[PDB]
Design a binder for this molecule. Structure first.
Ligand SMILES: *[C@@H]1O[C@H](CO[C@@H]2O[C@@H](C)[C@@H](O)[C@@H](O)[C@@H]2O)[C@@H](O[C@@H]2O[C@H](CO)[C@@H](O)[C@H](O)[C@H]2NC(C)=O)[C@H](O)[C@H]1NC(C)=O
Ligand SMILES: [Ca+2]
Ligand SMILES: [Ca+2]
Lengths: 4, 61, 291, 303, 4
């Protein structure tokens, strides 16, 4: 998923 | 005496590892179905891992 | 009073058993990388036809790629090598009636069915492919028609200078003479008895290929549509190797939807109402049946 | 102390600890069984159809109207290879480049297996001499490029959940570059119901988080070859690792069709090997934590 | 076969  | 608080930390590390291993082995078996003669027929038990983890939540609190 | 720490001993026994289990799981992963082993394998040897491949050093019968002179790209065929150096190019095969042979013009042009290394599958290679193989320079091709009934008997039919015309000529079946065989000359026609014109109107010598969507026969209606096949129809046929597969062999007029024989027939060997169990059409350069 | 009560926490501790040992023994027996089944491999007998062409599209125009394995030769320079063809779905002529339905093939492989092609193209239909049913396979990054640079090519991504619902992801233009350009993907002209995960990203993300999940214009990445848009120094912090396997990753995905196959559908972070949302994921339809039962990718000329 |  998204990697902030 | 003592040396119990480390053990409840130890079984917490195993239950999160074994549940992860249960799925990992399940995914790595069904992958030999298109490679080997036959795949080992098995059913996943996630409820038993989850209920035993909830059982230790009463222990810590 | 150490009832505990004993639980740590089993915990250390568990962790050690989990560590080595992951190593065994990693060993299992390596063996589960291969795909399923396919028995069907294409041989590396290629050439003009199956005879040119047989001359190169091929021994066993199986699936091969061939590329004729005037062909755009290579295509797969089934080659029959008998060990004497003979390489037959099979373009038609019938065994069980698994493949439907009621196909259109494009399907009979390009080809339908399946090709097996063992030679146990039904197929039609395609009129365009047969034409390109047969019309190769100088040396003509010899057609061999192998027939097998339901009793176990086998009969062969040989034709010299076998040629299939281009698409512009609607793939015309042409040959010089009937070479021989116990199956008989059905491409010359057969005297059925219904009319004195039967022998003339059942001949396949110099006849154009016909499907249900492309009519090219000498009949007012459609021979290929009524019989439900693709064949070099006249008015209509004496030999019908692309016909409907009837189980058992003997079929009556009642089984036919139209009222005209449409099974795998060869009038010179069997009766009009008898379908063959096995049918094979294969071609070879005509210099191979020499010396 | 008078009432130093509970060794119940120790009795419960022992009950769970002994329960794990029985499960370790259970998993030991399951792995050891498959080690014996893998001495002999699975066998298929896929007899090649007579009709050929440059792709599953040229076959249906030549008369191949049944959904099965076909032998194609895109160019005279390249060796002919086997591919599954969809002749029934939307006029037919679809060249299957990816297929997921069961869990019979591992999709966490190196750069080489993704370059050449792994898995099973097609499996036998019972009582038939031909292979009519498709299997799980990746066609190969080398085979797909060509199959997109021969002309205008459209992409169809079909997926199914674990209760029967079907959605589609269709793209008008689809091109993948060669190995020299690290197999860079290009998608345009979206149409469907599944959600635009390749061009737009995940729907439940705002700002930069959605932007870093865009697949359009990203390079191919396997667990031995780092090519994702994730700048880091730690070797473990890669998109191909901790996720499925080889895919056009960014930071990291909005869609992961080459992921780990989870049974049932619902999976969580503790079930995942590294904690991240690996598996057959399409966020624009079900989210990050749901694995799809079926997932297929197919290509066709756009004339 | 033949046609009448
Ligand atoms: C991008 O996401 C990050 C991380 O948030 C995580 O992912 C979200 C989609 C959601 O699932 C959260 O529950 C996860 O925690 C956001 O980071 C924020 O950072 C601020 C300041 O450090 C902090 O208050 C919170 O931890 C985070 N979440 C907030 C504010 O909701 C970040 O905001 C997202 N980016 C954008 C542009 O919205
Ligand atoms: Ca006519
Ligand atoms: Ca990177």
């Amino acid at each position: 998923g998204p990697r902030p | 005496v003592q040396h119990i608080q480390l053990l409840q930390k130890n079984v917490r590390a195993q239950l999160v590892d074994m549940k992860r291993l249960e799925v990992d082995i399940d995914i790595k078996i069904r992958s030999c179905r298109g490679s080997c003669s036959r795949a080992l027929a098995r059913e996943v038990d996630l409820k038993d891992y989850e209920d035993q983890q909830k059982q230790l939540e009463q222990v810590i609190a | 009073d150490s009832s505990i720490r004993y639980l740590q001993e089993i915990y250390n026994s568990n962790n050690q058993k989990i560590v080595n289990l992951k190593e065994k799981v990693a060993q299992l992963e390596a063996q589960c990388q291969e795909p399923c082993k396919d028995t069907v394998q294409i041989h590396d040897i290629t050439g003009k036809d199956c005879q040119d491949i047989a001359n190169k050093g091929a021994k066993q019968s199986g699936l091969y790629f061939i590329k004729p002179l005037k062909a755009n790209q290579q295509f797969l065929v089934y080659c029959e090598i008998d060990g004497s150096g003979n390489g037959w190019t099979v373009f038609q095969k019938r065994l069980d009636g698994s493949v439907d042979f009621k196909k259109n013009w494009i399907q009979y042009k390009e080809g339908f069915g399946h090709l097996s290394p063992t030679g146990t599958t039904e197929f039609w290679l395609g009129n365009e492919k047969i034409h390109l193989i047969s019309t190769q320079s100088a040396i003509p091709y010899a057609l061999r028609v192998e027939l097998e009934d339901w009793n176990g008997r086998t009969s062969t039919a040989d034709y010299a200078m076998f040629k299939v015309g281009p698409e512009a000529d609607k793939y015309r079946l042409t040959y010089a003479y009937f070479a021989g065989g116990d199956a008989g000359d059905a491409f010359d026609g057969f005297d059925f008895g219904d009319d004195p014109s039967d022998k003339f109107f059942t001949s396949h010598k110099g006849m154009q290929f016909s499907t249900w969507d492309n009519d090219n026969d000498k009949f007012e209606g459609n021979c290929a549509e009524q019989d439900g096949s693709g064949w070099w129809m006249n008015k209509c046929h004496a030999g019908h190797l692309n016909g409907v597969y009837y189980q058992g062999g003997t079929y009556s007029k009642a089984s036919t939807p139209n009222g005209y024989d449409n099974g795998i027939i060869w009038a010179t060997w069997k009766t009009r109402w008898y379908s063959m169990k096995k049918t094979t059409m294969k071609i070879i350069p005509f210099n191979r049946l020499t010396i | 102390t008078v009432n130093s009560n509970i060794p119940t926490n120790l009795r419960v501790l022992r009950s769970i600890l002994e329960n794990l040992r029985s499960k370790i023994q259970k998993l030991e027996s399951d792995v050891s069984a498959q080690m014996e089944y893998c001495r002999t491999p699975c066998t298929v007998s896929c007899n090649i159809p007579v009709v050929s062409g440059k792709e599953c599209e040229e076959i249906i125009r030549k008369g191949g109207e049944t959904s099965e394995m076909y032998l194609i030769q895109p160019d005279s320079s390249v060796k002919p290879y086997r591919v599954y063809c969809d002749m029934n779905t939307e006029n037919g002529g679809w060249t299957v480049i990816q297929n997921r339905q069961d869990g019979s093939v591992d999709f966490g492989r190196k750069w080489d297996p993704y370059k050449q092609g792994f898995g099973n193209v097609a499996t036998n239909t019972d009582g038939k001499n031909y292979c009519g049913l498709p299997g799980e396979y990746w066609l190969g990054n080398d085979k797909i490029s060509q199959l997109t640079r021969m002309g205008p090519t459209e992409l169809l991504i079909e997926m199914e959940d674990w209760k029967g619902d079907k959605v589609k992801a269709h793209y008008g233009g689809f091109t993948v570059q060669n190995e020299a350009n690290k197999y860079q993907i290009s998608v345009n002209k979206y149409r469907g119901t599944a959600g635009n995960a390749l061009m737009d990203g995940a729907s439940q993300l705002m700002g930069e988080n959605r932007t870093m999940t865009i697949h359009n214009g990203m390079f191919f990445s396997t667990y031995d070859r780092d090519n994702d848009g994730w700048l880091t120094s730690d070797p473990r912090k890669q998109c191909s690792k901790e996720d499925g396997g080889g895919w056009w990753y960014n930071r990291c995905h909005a869609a992961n069709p080459n992921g780990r196959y989870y049974w049932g559908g619902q999976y969580t972070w503790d079930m995942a090997k590294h904690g991240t949302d690996d598996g057959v994921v399409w966020m624009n339809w079900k989210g990050s934590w749901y694995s799809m039962r079926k997932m297929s990718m197919k290509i066709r000329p756009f004339f």
